[PDB]
Amino acid sequence: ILSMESGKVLRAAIRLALDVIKIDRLSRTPRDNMVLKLVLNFFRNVIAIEPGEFTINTKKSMPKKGITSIDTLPPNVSMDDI
């Protein structure tokens, strides 16, 4: 989402929002209000994604060496991308 065409999808999202901001505070229906809120949820989500935590099972005791690494990123991602 951030990288593709410098993130032109973000400009698509603001255009979808501008297409209710154009019609007045009086004009905007509950569906229009929802669409604007949905665009905000898109921006919030895109900010909010962050790598997960390595959630170990604790039924069985630890071996003579602990966890090898906490890194959870998939192989096509680097933390600089995020």
């Binding site: 071996p63 602990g66 690494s69």
Partner: protein, 266 residues
Amino acid sequence: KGMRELNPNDIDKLINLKGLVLRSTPVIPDMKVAFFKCNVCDHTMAVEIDRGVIQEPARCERIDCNEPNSMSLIHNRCSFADKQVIKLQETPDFVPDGQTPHSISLCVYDELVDSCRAGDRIEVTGTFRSIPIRANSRQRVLKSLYKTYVDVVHVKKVDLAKIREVAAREDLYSLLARSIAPSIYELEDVKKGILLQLFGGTNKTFRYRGDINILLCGDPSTSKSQILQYVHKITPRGVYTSGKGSSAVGLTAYITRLVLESGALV
């Protein structure tokens, strides 16, 4: 004291030895400080090696992490001293006539590495040491008699005014020529030729070089052998040999076991 005379009373004393270097290992990295990193939190701590043993931290140092068994050794961030092992043979001056020479392995460290090379006759001052050795690497079980080595702390082997003053002399050519072998009766143009051979010409980049080459023939039972011996004694880095065979020293470069050996010419 003799290498053959050492006995278990010496096992921690500072001793002195004399002998012949056979060979040395390449430099062996010896760990002085282990470097540990936490797998979970990437915190790092340095641990000094004590009596050769890694004092591994069982839990991560940081109380805000304190995970067990999570520290791992980062080999190429540890700090290493230099160790080298050298094999020293008992000098034939000391051997009894009817048996092989002994030898002792000696350990040498840091800037004392490569203090000597193969063929060097040396002294060493060092602590006589001994350590156990294992029956098999997968077990702690040790053999009941220790390897011995000496852990060395010292090693040792085995002007212009006059130059310009003598250079002013007029008789210098004859003076220097007679001086190369004054024990030998007059063969003075040979002596002059060999002196000029000792000086030699010059090199150039472009090959043409400064070597001068001489031969003596005529009857066998005459001074030519002594003349070769005297120039051999005079020259800084020359050799003495004869035209064929090899008493463990031969003329040509030669491939043997696989290694290339350089001959007397080279």
